[PDB]
Assembly symmetry: C2
């Protein structure tokens, strides 16, 4: 949990417009940037929160900004450019908001505002949001290269900002299809050297709980042998979605509603046999944005999730007007919100009818349960890994390249305090022990893990976070480096301009 209040309101700098740079700045280092750290931290976020006098209303509406911190020989640079999306270009052209963003209707056509994340396919990098348009970008110059419409290649209406990436370069993702949820597989770059998006395909299909209302889906789970998809009670109302939008005046946020009765339905597919498994896993209601990690232990899937306890859409609390309130008002607003909680679900693969009425989760080191009912539903209870009052462990990351889809011990995350990011956390998922890094009036981003080249252990490396530190006595922002073992500060690299909120990113080694 946080041990800090924010009466000064410095967090408002997260949602304040900034200018791009025309070339890299030097970041002034204190401490020692590790000498083995060679590459680029690439991150996406909104950078422009109004077009002249027309404002963006929601956290996910600001125009995409691509950020880069470079590391070489203990020296650091910072660079950023706006992504030349249709939404951005046409807004600069017409000096107004032209494309409807997530929660901002444009007055007189799907947004490609790639503000959420960046990821590799083949030798290319794509910035993304959650729509059908992803944007190829140049990771060295931050120049915008091309828009790609995923509907040109595969049958999905959108895809998450959270594709899984196997070590050989294979990319998996999930998207709604107008009804089902499809898993797209993009293969690695082959000897022919043609673009792997051309070779995309749907490999498996998850069914929908309601024919005219699919669930919102933000991420999913992957293991060597299985795909896990969590169907929540936050639904997209297709009657409001497909009807004339600039007649009534609707945005994306206007089409969400909550199913009160369904709870959460969990779904598994066989990855290698490309087949849906018909096990009716069921639990109580929560919003889910981020899977932490998924793995196989004897005949059981371990599913670690950052949950929000309730069925109201957490995104209702992320309008900019609310996030820019004063600290007492921010806290008051979050009182009725769903409660964050890290939970471990355990999904049995072997269901024997003879065990009807009993707990199938026979593993020796969990309290998660799964109960086979007579109607063949499997009712799940979680093991809580972390719980603090309006203290979210969110934006989780692990040592992904060596432990994704595999037995693991450590997660890192951003700590939210009534939605305000004010700390960095590490969680031992076996023991439930936690570590915190926190300074007053300091607003960090998602921590990203980078392994030491000679690492023998899971947490032998550093985490990188972008921290916004307003209020004089400091420079406006800095790149923070923490030791992954205990979250003790290794270095920081200060820059002389403000940085807004960023969501997701990656480290690109070189």
């Amino acid at each position: 949990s946080s041990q800090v209040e924010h009466p000064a309101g410095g967090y408002k700098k997260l949602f304040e417009t900034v200018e791009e740079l025309s070339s890299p700045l030097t970041a002034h280092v204190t401490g020692r940037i590790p000498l083995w750290l060679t590459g680029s931290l690439l991150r996406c976020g909104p950078g422009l929160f109004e077009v002249g006098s027309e404002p963006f209303y929601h956290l996910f509406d600001g125009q995409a900004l691509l950020h880069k911190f470079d590391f070489k020989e203990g020296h650091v640079t910072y660079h950023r450019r706006f992504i030349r999306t249709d939404a951005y270009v046409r807004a600069m052209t017409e000096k107004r908001i032209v494309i409807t963003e997530f929660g901002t209707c444009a007055f007189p056509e799907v947004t490609d505002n790639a503000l959420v994340n960046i990821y590799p396919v083949g030798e290319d990098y794509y910035a993304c949001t959650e729509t059908n348009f992803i944007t190829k970008v140049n990771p060295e110059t931050l120049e915008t290269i091309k828009q790609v419409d995923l509907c040109n290649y595969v049958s999905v209406n959108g895809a998450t900002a959270h594709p899984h990436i196997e070590n050989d370069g294979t990319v998996y993702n999930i998207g709604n299809c107008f009804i089902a949820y499809n898993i797209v597989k993009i293969p690695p770059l082959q000897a022919d050297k043609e673009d792997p998006i051309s070779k995309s395909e749907i490999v498996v299909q998850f069914p929908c709980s309601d024919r005219f209302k699919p669930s919102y889906v933000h991420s999913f789970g992957l293991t060597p042998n299985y795909i896990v998809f969590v169907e929540t009670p936050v639904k997209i109302n297709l009657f409001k979605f497909l009807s004339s939008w600039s007649l009534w005046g609707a945005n994306y946020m206007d089409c969400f509603e909550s199913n009160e009765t369904m709870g959460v339905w969990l779904h598994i597919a066989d990855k290698k046999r490309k087949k849906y498994i018909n096990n009716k896993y069921r639990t109580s209601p929560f919003n889910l944005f981020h899977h932490i990690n998924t793995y196989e232990d004897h005949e059981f899937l371990i599913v670690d999730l950052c949950c929000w306890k309730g069925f109201e859409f957490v995104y209702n609390y992320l309008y900019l007007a609310n996030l820019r309130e004063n600290w007492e008002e921010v806290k008051k607003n979050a009182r009725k919100a769903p409660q964050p909680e890290v939970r471990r679900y355990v999904l049995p693969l072997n269901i024997d009818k003879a065990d009807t009425g009993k707990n199938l989760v026979t593993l020796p080191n969990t309290t998660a349960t799964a109960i086979l009912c007579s109607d063949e539903t499997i009712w799940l209870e979680p093991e809580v890994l972390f719980s603090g009052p309006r203290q979210a462990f969110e934006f989780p990351q692990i040592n992904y390249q060596k432990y994704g889809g595999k037995p693991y011990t450590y997660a890192y995350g951003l700590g939210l305090n009534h939605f305000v990011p004010d700390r960095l956390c590490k969680l031992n998922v076996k023991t439930k022990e936690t570590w915190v890094w926190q300074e007053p009036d300091s607003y960090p981003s998602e921590p990203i893990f980078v392994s030491h080249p000679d690492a023998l252990e899971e947490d032998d490396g550093v985490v990188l976070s972008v921290v916004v530190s307003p209020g004089a006595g400091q420079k406006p922002a800095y790149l923070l480096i923490l030791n992954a073992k205990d979250l003790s500060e290794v270095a920081r690299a200060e820059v002389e301009i403000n940085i807004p909120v960023t969501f997701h990113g990656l480290f690109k080694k070189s």
Copy 2:
């Protein structure tokens, strides 16, 4: 959690018959019994596990045995007598099992085998089970005084072994009524000096979820202003219950079944206005035996519970044949059992219709939620206070006289390890910090708290536990005294005879 295995099988001495004494033994003390500790530890449990060659099958079938440890001027005695119940007396008379116990049918009339607990009414003490018969006993001589039939006074078919006791002597309890659940209030001893059981009355009534199937109920919650009752999916099947028993040949265990779909319904009544409150609090399925404590915080009830995750009846795992298995087999048997978990529920008293869809639990220091649905059900999620794999924090106790029904910080309990009691625990319910006391091949009982008489602090006292320590190098058993602050050992008082399992009790000051 436990840090100990039990391959030697010493826990089998908990379920082995013993002889009563004709007068007190000295307990050999090591360490220093506190000089302010003056009174009697009184405890109940089964002492006779077969009548000749007819065996009792279930943990709750053995004939009631009343135990007493006396403390005066740093010196200790131990004494025990069988309770001369009908069941016991008639069994000694007829040299066979005459009355049907909980899970042992007698072959050719309700049991009064008072093996569970002992409690004060007026100037008297009553040993009890969960039936309509309670047994007045003499707390100094351990003589049986009389049988009391509660049906002679008030309209209930049984009452729990867990009445609440307000400081003025007022006694509340709950019982099934063949359909409703009635709260009985027995008033304190008055100036007229007549027996308070004659002044018993039903003050409030809780409804039933199913007309022909009432839930098993073991305990309930009480605050200055409210009564809380938790209706679980472990049901008593009245069609099997009332039909002729010694025709086919049924016991009590044969009449329990699990409702798969209802989950858990929670109920509040207004204590002082003697009125049921019509709030439909609902959650996922669990067995419940012990409430820890209940209290009021602003307009919310805090409900702390020792839960078992699942709907199968935990009592299915407590046949003596299973509990007497070898360690590897005991562990294997418990694998499919419900998982123990300490949970905090938070029940809002002010339900506004305007908050439909939202989390009503606006308190600042909990992660528990309560969600108002459109059908006016209030869906609850807990805050988990403690969770270990087949490690139950059970038989909870608090500093009851000063903190029962009130804001509190500390609970004590018996740690079960795949149902085997092998340690003593303290839980800070605000911070979730735990303390453990454990020695190899040592099988403790419920810890009972005793305040230093001049304590201002909640945990300024000691806990007392009866510990069975088989295997040579020690005497068969001992009374343990721990400091309540940190569970460090203060003294023990060894006795030269075995003691079987005991369930509940009290400290009687003098």
